[PDB]
RNA sequence: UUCAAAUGAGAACUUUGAAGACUGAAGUGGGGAAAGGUUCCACGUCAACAGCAGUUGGACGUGGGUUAGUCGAUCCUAAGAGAUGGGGAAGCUCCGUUUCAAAGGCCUGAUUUUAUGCAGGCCACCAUCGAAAGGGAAUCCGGUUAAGAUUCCGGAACCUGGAUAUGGAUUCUUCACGGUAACGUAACUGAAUGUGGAGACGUCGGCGCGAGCCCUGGGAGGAGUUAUCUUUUCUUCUUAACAGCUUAUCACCCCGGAAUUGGUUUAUCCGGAGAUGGGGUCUUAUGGCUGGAAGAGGCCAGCACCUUUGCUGGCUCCGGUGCGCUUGUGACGGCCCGUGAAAAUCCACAGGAAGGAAUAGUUUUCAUGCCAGGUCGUACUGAUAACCGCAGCAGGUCUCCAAGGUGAACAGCCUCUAGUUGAUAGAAUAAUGUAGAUAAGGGAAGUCGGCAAAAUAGAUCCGUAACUUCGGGAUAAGGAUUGGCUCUAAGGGUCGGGUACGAUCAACUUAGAACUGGUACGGACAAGGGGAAUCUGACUGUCUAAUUAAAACAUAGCAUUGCGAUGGUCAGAAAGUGAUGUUGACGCAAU
RNA sequence: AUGGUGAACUAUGCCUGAAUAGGGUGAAGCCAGAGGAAACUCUGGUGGAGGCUCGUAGCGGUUCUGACGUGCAAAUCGAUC
């Protein structure tokens, strides 16, 4: 049957102003302001949240070791590893067929 | 008297456009060397919804010729484009939906949209959804082209004016009854303050030329001279005929 | 606000030269279900942190207290 | 259990708006909420997100199209007319 | 505590003691959810236990999403009767 | 207004220090015309308008 | 409201106790925003003020009181405002905001005459202002005052800017290894440049999981009742930021390869584009144990005693439950001619500029250690007397927390925690009033007119017409039951079976039957009157604030009209000028 | 007539925030059964749409032509809506 207030001068229920209700050691309920949740980083290609990265707020990554912010593939903390699997396939087989095109332009000289 | 409601839109205070959610100005690419001597390829990254407009937009990402980077631009999306499509742009490009060519490079009877009035204005004509112009003929000397504007007017433009192949997406839009005053409210909040419209009949002799009288009626002809003057003009303006068609 | 597990690692921080003071807390608890025992904690104060070692077997806890360095000024209980 | 007889999807509008208008909307809103085959992935995932934009949830292709339906009427005869003029010059 | 201990035996429950509608009191959705989560989850233990095979499971699973099933006991008399339909027809063909 | 600007708070403090009556020894002075403090302000009577 | 006591010269009104009540947690409580400005607090005093009184006071005289690296501002941008360059204007000044502009300072190489010349390359975003509710670096518990605290005290953390030292790691394969893979880890080089993520976003609906609250059983204490009954009724058993370790939906990898198609959600979506199945990776909101941290806080008992007061022991434990309530969150679904901010800021990746191992050379994104963290705000009310209404005015004014019962319910009524008991009083009970009730018989005969009052009312079962745009009309109209007690029935769970049954735990739901009574039972509260037509506007919606809420305005729908930009409609005094227009006929403008 | 001051009230658009018990009706979409040659129709579920509906807080201001009308109030109070 206890009731509790804001601990700050913002009376209003806005997005930053959230409250959690905490039982202190001194027996009383008291409100606790909570910070907005962290979003997982996204693949810049497929958009699916790319696993292995720690989910923090933006400036809380400046405080963290580099193993949290990365994986050990090429394009580690950036693309989702199935978007890296493709662009290796696509880089090899496009510049594969692209060699076959440049011999035909030598043959089309001597064939005509 | 008073200053009437259509005279009151010029000073543009609460009548300006509601611009917040708009992705940008949809234009074609600046006319450069690579496009007028050859073609340059982008790909369409995502085709997306623009607020206040009726037709979707596409974002195609080109490669800057003279500096290392990407540049992405806003095209009004023709119907049939899809993300992952190569979009070719230039004089030597090919005739396929979404490729922007000069108009001199396409045969007569070709359906293009977002065509330019003059070369390098980055698009004018037929930008609304479902519209297109047809190319009905050429004039290879003193170069021009004969095209049919979506209204049915026949205009003659330069042959260096680009245009993008196909019909603009968002066709069929006005087929659907709007059904309630709410859905017309959500339409014009993203456009401008035009709505709702009080009939000038229903207001006072100050508010309008149609106002006053112990009955609701106009009292003089509702067709006004083109040579009318500021604020006299309300009603059907300089009409050649009037009344239901037969 | 940290905890140490190995006894040896605790013997290091006591010499780490940032540690001016320590303390020994005695807590009487019980284990398993039935019977009690005497539990002690050693709290060494760093500059930026407070380390503690928990000794639940009193056969070890006495050999440790004598082993504390003489410079470290200990507040017992 | 078919429930309603005539009105179908427009039963949400109740008795209001008049029978024609409610029947003329029932024409389109069965098109815009319908589920279409996907010309790329080979499944039918395609649904409308907004006027003009049609999104596959399988192959993640987005496809521009008609407002209330995938392929507009006057469009399918543009990509044939464009297919014909292309071959005209290359044949 | 005595007023609530009287209800636990059913007292003060009658029609003159009811004010809100039979849904407001106990919504009919929550009852269906309970019915089905109980049915839907009893099939999953039989399939795992080998006393029903995934061909008959997949049949009963979709009957339960319609009804033909009054409660947990009717389904268990149903399986036993349905399962016994697999024995006879096989045995008769043998 | 419970969270303030310094130029306002500096003007509250000037009005707090004019808020007292005459000191008595002023009346005793030769040729004194002054009787009482005629500019006394009160938070129940006149609001100072910032 | 009342009694008594205390103060005083004086008490319906001040203070304490004793009663009696009330607001009832959508408060008459506990806090803030705008606004006020000292109203806060202490002592004195009672001329005036408090529309009676006054020893009391938001009054009067004198004083004291607001403590920050973490809370705000400060910073960023929004919608807009506004210099500069230019351009008008007799001029006050106007346009415009990157514009017809020679609009600027960086990264280090070249220097070991000395510091920065000369060097290549760059990057073209080119003022500023604009939010105490948006974005955002970081603080918690306990104690403390007459009045201040996330600021003071004690303890436990954290962030940022800067300096360098130690340990580890790496290096002879100069710039690490492991796992098939998802990826792992204490570390584990990286310039110009480029790209990607975060910041960063609508709403509704049910479903899941959490936190506080609610309910509640065993046990350890304290209080209230006891004429009788009651293993009884009430109350205390509490656990912060932070740190380390393990944990889960969704996502993913490997193996294998599916018809007898299987999996599967409350909600039918998924699979040869590789499903079920077997085994793994991952995020860590959240929960779990350990450190904080019992030494704190609380509740009990025992001793001393003008003081100051301490001292002294003990216990501070183990559990259950849910369509419960409040808020957070996750995965799904619905809706749109509506798809629901920007930026600073921070990070990763691509690239390879350079710089450096062998007699020894780095790395401050691993550990530990070291130094500094400024300026203004901080009191109190936030309203039936601190704001605005000439005032101590029944008006007006944005917001958070929210206990038990009854019940569908955040309705009404009643209570627990906290808060008041303030509004001039006393005696009498005329008329007429104002507010609230009741009436024999009749049942609008009253009146411009059923105005006003009454009747109806909740739920369960039975039953429902013309007409209709087939959606409705429909709670149509109308009928029957309802308390109490004692029973019967149906609905769930956890659990062991060699490769049919038993047991235990725990719910508010429905239906049925006997008995029962002054026929009473939605017992107070709460709670539609219904039907046959006519004129009129389709509907929802809006308007004369303070005599009109309408049949008027609006609307969808219908139709007409101008307009292809060198343009349509409009603005400006002018203009190197502006709105539609971040526009293009499925558009804009005028009806 | 000239030169100045006002959107703290109110009017309307924008930007960025916040606010809203409990019930009734039960649309698409979906599941099982029944009929039949078919197109499909009929029953039982499931779901939870609407400028739907009853009704609190909220916003209004219909009737009493109530109270008040040198008022509490230069627009308020009660019941009704």
Coordinates of N, CA and C (backbone and C1' of nucleotides) in Angstrom, one line a residue, chain H residues 5-49:
Chain H
rU5 P 5.8 48.6 -32.1 O5' 4.6 48.4 -31.0 C5' 4.9 48.4 -29.7 C4' 3.8 47.7 -28.9 C3' 3.6 46.3 -29.2 O3' 4.4 45.4 -28.5 C1' 1.5 47.5 -29.2
rG6 P 4.4 43.8 -28.7 O5' 3.2 43.3 -27.9 C5' 2.8 42.0 -27.9 C4' 1.3 41.8 -27.7 C3' 0.7 40.6 -28.5 O3' 0.8 39.4 -27.8 C1' -0.6 42.5 -28.8
rA7 P 1.5 38.1 -28.5 O5' 0.3 37.3 -29.0 C5' -0.8 37.0 -28.2 C4' -1.4 35.7 -28.5 C3' -0.4 34.6 -28.8 O3' -0.8 33.4 -28.2 C1' -2.0 34.7 -30.5
rA8 P 0.3 32.5 -27.4 O5' 0.6 33.3 -26.1 C5' -0.4 34.0 -25.3 C4' -0.7 33.3 -24.0 C3' -2.1 33.4 -23.5 O3' -2.5 32.2 -22.8 C1' -0.7 34.3 -21.9
rC9 P -3.2 31.0 -23.5 O5' -4.7 31.5 -23.6 C5' -5.5 31.7 -22.4 C4' -6.8 32.3 -22.7 C3' -7.6 31.8 -23.9 O3' -8.2 30.6 -23.7 C1' -7.6 34.1 -24.0
rU10 P -8.1 29.3 -24.6 O5' -8.8 29.8 -26.0 C5' -10.2 30.0 -26.1 C4' -10.5 30.8 -27.4 C3' -10.0 30.1 -28.6 O3' -10.8 29.1 -29.1 C1' -9.4 32.4 -28.7
rA11 P -10.2 27.8 -29.9 O5' -10.0 28.4 -31.3 C5' -11.2 28.9 -32.1 C4' -10.8 29.5 -33.4 C3' -9.8 28.7 -34.3 O3' -10.5 27.7 -35.0 C1' -9.0 30.9 -34.1
rU12 P -10.2 26.2 -34.6 O5' -9.0 25.7 -35.6 C5' -9.3 25.7 -37.0 C4' -8.1 26.0 -37.8 C3' -6.9 25.0 -37.6 O3' -7.0 23.8 -38.3 C1' -6.2 27.3 -37.7
rG13 P -6.2 22.5 -37.9 O5' -4.7 22.7 -38.5 C5' -4.5 22.5 -39.8 C4' -3.1 22.9 -40.2 C3' -1.9 22.3 -39.5 O3' -1.7 21.0 -40.0 C1' -1.6 24.6 -39.7
rC14 P -1.1 19.8 -39.0 O5' 0.4 20.2 -38.8 C5' 1.3 20.0 -39.9 C4' 2.5 20.9 -39.6 C3' 3.5 20.4 -38.5 O3' 4.3 19.4 -39.0 C1' 3.1 22.7 -38.3
rC15 P 4.4 18.0 -38.2 O5' 5.6 18.2 -37.2 C5' 6.8 18.8 -37.6 C4' 7.7 19.2 -36.4 C3' 7.6 18.3 -35.2 O3' 8.5 17.2 -35.3 C1' 7.3 20.5 -34.5
rU16 P 7.9 15.7 -34.8 O5' 8.6 15.5 -33.4 C5' 9.6 16.3 -32.9 C4' 9.5 16.5 -31.5 C3' 8.7 15.4 -30.8 O3' 9.6 14.3 -30.4 C1' 7.8 17.4 -30.1
rG17 P 9.0 13.0 -29.9 O5' 8.5 13.3 -28.4 C5' 7.3 12.7 -27.9 C4' 6.9 13.4 -26.6 C3' 5.8 12.8 -25.8 O3' 6.1 11.7 -25.0 C1' 5.5 15.1 -25.9
rA18 P 5.2 10.3 -25.1 O5' 4.1 10.6 -24.1 C5' 4.3 11.0 -22.7 C4' 3.1 11.7 -22.1 C3' 1.8 10.8 -22.1 O3' 1.8 9.9 -21.0 C1' 1.4 13.0 -22.8
rA19 P 0.9 8.6 -21.1 O5' -0.6 9.2 -21.0 C5' -1.1 9.8 -19.8 C4' -2.5 10.2 -19.9 C3' -3.5 9.1 -20.5 O3' -3.9 8.3 -19.4 C1' -3.8 11.2 -21.6
rU20 P -3.8 6.7 -19.5 O5' -5.3 6.2 -20.0 C5' -6.4 6.3 -19.2 C4' -7.7 6.4 -19.9 C3' -7.9 5.3 -20.9 O3' -8.5 4.2 -20.2 C1' -8.3 7.3 -22.0
rA21 P -7.9 2.7 -20.2 O5' -8.9 1.8 -19.5 C5' -10.0 2.4 -18.8 C4' -10.4 1.6 -17.6 C3' -11.0 0.2 -17.7 O3' -10.0 -0.8 -17.8 C1' -12.4 1.5 -16.3
rG22 P -10.3 -2.1 -18.7 O5' -11.7 -2.5 -18.3 C5' -12.0 -3.3 -17.2 C4' -13.5 -3.5 -16.9 C3' -14.2 -4.3 -17.9 O3' -14.2 -5.7 -17.6 C1' -15.4 -2.3 -17.6
rG23 P -14.5 -6.8 -18.7 O5' -16.1 -6.7 -18.8 C5' -16.7 -6.9 -20.1 C4' -18.1 -6.3 -20.1 C3' -19.0 -6.7 -21.3 O3' -19.5 -8.0 -21.2 C1' -19.1 -4.4 -20.9
rG24 P -19.6 -8.8 -22.6 O5' -20.6 -8.1 -23.5 C5' -22.0 -8.2 -23.3 C4' -22.8 -7.4 -24.2 C3' -22.7 -7.8 -25.7 O3' -23.6 -8.9 -25.9 C1' -22.4 -5.5 -25.6
rU25 P -23.2 -10.1 -26.8 O5' -23.1 -9.5 -28.3 C5' -24.3 -9.1 -29.0 C4' -24.0 -8.3 -30.2 C3' -23.2 -8.9 -31.3 O3' -24.1 -9.7 -32.1 C1' -22.3 -6.8 -30.9
rG26 P -23.7 -11.3 -32.4 O5' -22.3 -11.2 -33.1 C5' -22.1 -10.3 -34.2 C4' -20.6 -10.2 -34.6 C3' -19.9 -11.5 -34.9 O3' -19.0 -11.3 -36.0 C1' -18.7 -10.5 -33.2
rA27 P -19.0 -12.2 -37.3 O5' -18.4 -11.3 -38.4 C5' -19.2 -10.4 -39.1 C4' -18.4 -9.6 -40.2 C3' -17.4 -10.4 -40.9 O3' -17.9 -11.1 -42.0 C1' -16.4 -8.5 -40.0
rA28 P -17.3 -12.4 -42.6 O5' -16.4 -11.9 -43.8 C5' -15.2 -12.6 -44.1 C4' -14.1 -11.7 -44.4 C3' -12.7 -12.3 -44.5 O3' -12.4 -12.8 -45.8 C1' -12.6 -10.5 -43.0
rG29 P -12.3 -14.4 -46.0 O5' -11.0 -14.8 -45.4 C5' -9.8 -14.1 -45.6 C4' -8.8 -14.4 -44.6 C3' -8.7 -15.8 -44.1 O3' -7.9 -16.6 -45.0 C1' -8.7 -14.4 -42.2
rC30 P -8.3 -18.1 -45.3 O5' -8.2 -18.9 -43.9 C5' -6.9 -19.1 -43.3 C4' -7.0 -19.8 -42.0 C3' -7.8 -21.1 -42.0 O3' -6.9 -22.2 -42.3 C1' -8.6 -19.8 -40.2
rC31 P -7.6 -23.6 -42.8 O5' -8.1 -24.3 -41.5 C5' -7.2 -24.7 -40.5 C4' -8.0 -25.4 -39.4 C3' -8.9 -26.5 -39.8 O3' -8.3 -27.7 -40.1 C1' -10.0 -25.1 -38.2
rA32 P -9.0 -28.7 -41.1 O5' -10.2 -29.4 -40.2 C5' -10.0 -30.5 -39.5 C4' -11.2 -30.9 -38.6 C3' -12.4 -31.5 -39.4 O3' -12.2 -32.8 -39.7 C1' -13.1 -29.8 -38.0
rG33 P -12.9 -33.4 -41.0 O5' -14.5 -33.4 -40.6 C5' -15.0 -34.2 -39.6 C4' -16.4 -33.8 -39.2 C3' -17.5 -34.1 -40.3 O3' -17.9 -35.4 -40.4 C1' -17.8 -31.9 -39.4
rA34 P -18.4 -35.9 -41.8 O5' -19.7 -35.0 -42.1 C5' -20.9 -35.3 -41.4 C4' -22.1 -34.5 -41.9 C3' -22.4 -34.6 -43.4 O3' -23.0 -35.8 -43.8 C1' -22.4 -32.4 -42.9
rG35 P -22.7 -36.5 -45.2 O5' -23.3 -35.5 -46.2 C5' -24.7 -35.2 -46.2 C4' -25.1 -34.2 -47.3 C3' -24.6 -34.5 -48.7 O3' -25.4 -35.6 -49.3 C1' -24.4 -32.2 -48.3
rG36 P -24.6 -36.8 -50.1 O5' -24.4 -36.2 -51.6 C5' -25.5 -35.8 -52.3 C4' -25.2 -34.6 -53.2 C3' -24.1 -34.9 -54.3 O3' -24.5 -35.6 -55.4 C1' -23.6 -32.9 -53.2
rA37 P -23.4 -36.6 -56.2 O5' -22.2 -35.6 -56.5 C5' -21.0 -36.1 -56.9 C4' -20.4 -35.4 -58.1 C3' -20.0 -34.0 -57.9 O3' -18.6 -33.9 -57.4 C1' -21.4 -34.1 -59.8
rA38 P -18.2 -32.8 -56.3 O5' -18.4 -31.4 -57.1 C5' -17.4 -30.9 -57.9 C4' -18.0 -30.0 -59.0 C3' -18.3 -28.5 -58.5 O3' -17.2 -27.7 -58.6 C1' -20.2 -29.4 -59.6
rA39 P -16.5 -27.1 -57.3 O5' -16.7 -25.5 -57.5 C5' -16.6 -24.9 -58.8 C4' -17.8 -23.9 -59.0 C3' -18.1 -23.0 -57.8 O3' -17.3 -21.8 -57.7 C1' -20.1 -24.0 -58.5
rC40 P -17.4 -20.8 -56.5 O5' -17.9 -21.7 -55.3 C5' -18.7 -21.1 -54.3 C4' -20.0 -21.9 -54.2 C3' -20.7 -21.9 -52.8 O3' -21.5 -20.7 -52.6 C1' -20.7 -24.1 -53.7
rU41 P -21.3 -19.8 -51.2 O5' -22.5 -20.4 -50.3 C5' -23.8 -20.4 -50.7 C4' -24.6 -21.6 -50.3 C3' -24.7 -21.8 -48.8 O3' -25.7 -21.0 -48.2 C1' -24.2 -23.9 -49.9
rC42 P -25.8 -21.0 -46.6 O5' -26.7 -22.2 -46.2 C5' -27.3 -22.3 -45.0 C4' -27.1 -23.7 -44.3 C3' -26.4 -23.6 -43.0 O3' -27.2 -23.2 -41.9 C1' -25.5 -25.4 -44.3
rU43 P -26.5 -22.4 -40.7 O5' -25.8 -23.5 -39.8 C5' -26.6 -24.5 -39.2 C4' -25.7 -25.5 -38.4 C3' -24.7 -24.9 -37.5 O3' -25.3 -24.4 -36.2 C1' -23.7 -26.5 -38.8
rG44 P -24.6 -23.2 -35.4 O5' -23.3 -23.9 -34.8 C5' -23.4 -25.1 -33.9 C4' -22.1 -25.7 -33.7 C3' -21.0 -24.8 -33.1 O3' -21.1 -24.4 -31.8 C1' -20.1 -26.1 -34.9
rG45 P -20.8 -22.9 -31.3 O5' -19.3 -23.0 -30.8 C5' -18.3 -22.3 -31.5 C4' -17.0 -23.1 -31.7 C3' -15.7 -22.4 -31.7 O3' -15.2 -22.1 -30.4 C1' -15.8 -23.7 -33.6
rU46 P -14.9 -20.7 -29.9 O5' -13.6 -20.4 -30.8 C5' -12.4 -21.1 -30.7 C4' -11.4 -20.7 -31.8 C3' -11.0 -19.2 -31.7 O3' -10.0 -18.9 -30.8 C1' -11.5 -19.9 -33.9
rG47 P -10.0 -17.5 -30.1 O5' -9.7 -16.5 -31.3 C5' -8.4 -16.2 -31.8 C4' -8.5 -15.4 -33.1 C3' -8.8 -14.0 -32.9 O3' -7.7 -13.2 -32.7 C1' -10.3 -14.9 -34.5
rG48 P -7.4 -12.3 -31.5 O5' -8.0 -10.8 -31.9 C5' -7.8 -10.4 -33.2 C4' -9.0 -9.6 -33.6 C3' -9.3 -8.4 -32.8 O3' -9.8 -7.3 -33.6 C1' -11.2 -9.9 -32.8
rA49 P -9.4 -5.8 -33.3 O5' -9.9 -5.0 -34.5 C5' -9.3 -5.2 -35.8 C4' -10.3 -4.9 -36.9 C3' -11.1 -3.6 -36.7 O3' -10.4 -2.5 -37.2 C1' -12.5 -5.4 -37.3

